[PDB]
Amino acid sequence: APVTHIWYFKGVPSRLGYLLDLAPKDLEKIIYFAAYVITSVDDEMRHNELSTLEAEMAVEKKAVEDQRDADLEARAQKLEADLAELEAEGAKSDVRRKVRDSGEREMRQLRDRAQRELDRLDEIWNTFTKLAPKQLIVDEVLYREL
Amino acid sequence: LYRRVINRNNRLKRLIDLGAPEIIVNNEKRMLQESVDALFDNGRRGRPV
Amino acid sequence: RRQPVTVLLKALGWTNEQIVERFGFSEIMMGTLEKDTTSGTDEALLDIYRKLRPGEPPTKESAQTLLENLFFK
Amino acid sequence: DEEESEALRQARKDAELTASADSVRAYLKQIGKVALLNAEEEVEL
């Protein structure tokens, strides 16, 4: 495995840092296998096939939206089903309140998980479209996705 | 110091030969880097050997 | 890294009334307390844990037992 | 207020992208990703 001479890596100033214009803290992570760095990006190929990627991303976003809507519909149907056997008996508001709270929390979780997935997808797309050489990717999952 | 380098440099050659998972290979590469660094300048980056 | 002592007091289990009751003599104490953005013991504990041990992710039990073993054991 | 909160989530996310200059800490923090296997998945593998 190639190794970098310590003298030029960090010497106050860092000769490699000045040569490539990477901060020593960022350059340190690359050398010691802490974060990935982009060596080359194909701009010409990306431009010739950019709209297709936009459509392929939009289809996935729409699929996520449809799945979230279906999950919300199913959970709402369950909510309306659990109010039939609990309203026949003349109980107090506590018996009804628990179901209402559980359903509301389920709706909130179903919505926010989908929102997080959409945000992650948008982050992936934005990182890809702005990708440039000498760019440090610190997240392993994001790099695998890319 | 030299000995350590050689040792690690040998272990890597084995790990790559039998196709170890990327995590172990990366760890071995990092160890080799640190060993070479300490050989040239001990105690510069991390705790001295 | 340095930080206001009010966060340390909050993490130790002090609400934002006992600090005023005890340290009402001085003015720098009130300046620090007012300037302190953190609110509540839980808020201070998370920041203290993040700063002292940024590597591992914060948790509840570990954050609560952090200062206990650090000095009082 | 210390669960599924935007403040806690930010802290947890930031704690993962830490340099961890110490080599031993870097390795230990990395091998914790994969969860432990039970008896049956070992046989399956």
Chain C residues within 8 A of D18 when measuring between CB atoms: 54-55
What does the DSSP assignment read for A20-79? Answer: HT--HHHHHHHHTTSSEE-----HHHHHHTHHHHHHHHHHHHHHHHHHHHHHHHHHHHHH
The Cα D11–Cα A48 span in angstroms is 40
Identify the DSSP state of A137: E
**Interface touch D11/C57, C-beta < 8 Å:** yes
**Interface touch A6/B30, C-beta < 8 Å:** no
Name the pairing type of β-strands A136-137 and A36-37: antiparallel
Task: Tell how many helices (H) and how many strands (E) occur in chain B.
Answer: 2, 0
**Interface touch D19/A29, C-beta < 8 Å:** yes
Using CA atoms, how far residue B21 sits from A16, B17, B18, D7, D44, in Å, is: 30, 11, 10, 35, 19
CA B46 to chain centre: 14
Chain C residue closest to D1 (CA)? C42
**B–D contact (≥3 CB pairs within 8 Å)?**
yes
> With contact defined as beta carbons under 8 Å apart, do A57 and A39 qualify?
no
Size of interface B-D (CB pairs under 8 A): 10
The Cα C11–Cα C43 span in angstroms is 8
For this PDB entry, the determination method is cryo-EM
Nearest alpha-carbon partner for A95 in A85, A105, A104, A109: A85
Spell C32-58 as b/e; 16+ CB within 10 A means b: bbeebebeebbbbbbbbbbeeeeebbb
**Smallest Cα distance from D38 to chain B, Å:** 21
The Cα A1–Cα B31 span in angstroms is 11
Non-local (6+) Cβ contacts of C19 within 8 A are C6, C9, C29, C33
Chain A residue closest to B34 (CA)? A32
**Interface touch A28/D20, C-beta < 8 Å:** no
The Cα D45–Cα D42 span in angstroms is 5
**Smallest Cα distance from A35 to chain D, Å:** 9
Resolution in A: 3.1
Chains in contact with chain B (at least 3 beta-carbon pairs closer than 8 A): A, D
- Three-state secondary structure call for residue A136: strand
**Interface touch D19/A139, C-beta < 8 Å:** no
Q: Among partner residues A3, A5, A6, which is closest to B32 by beta-carbon distance?
A: A3
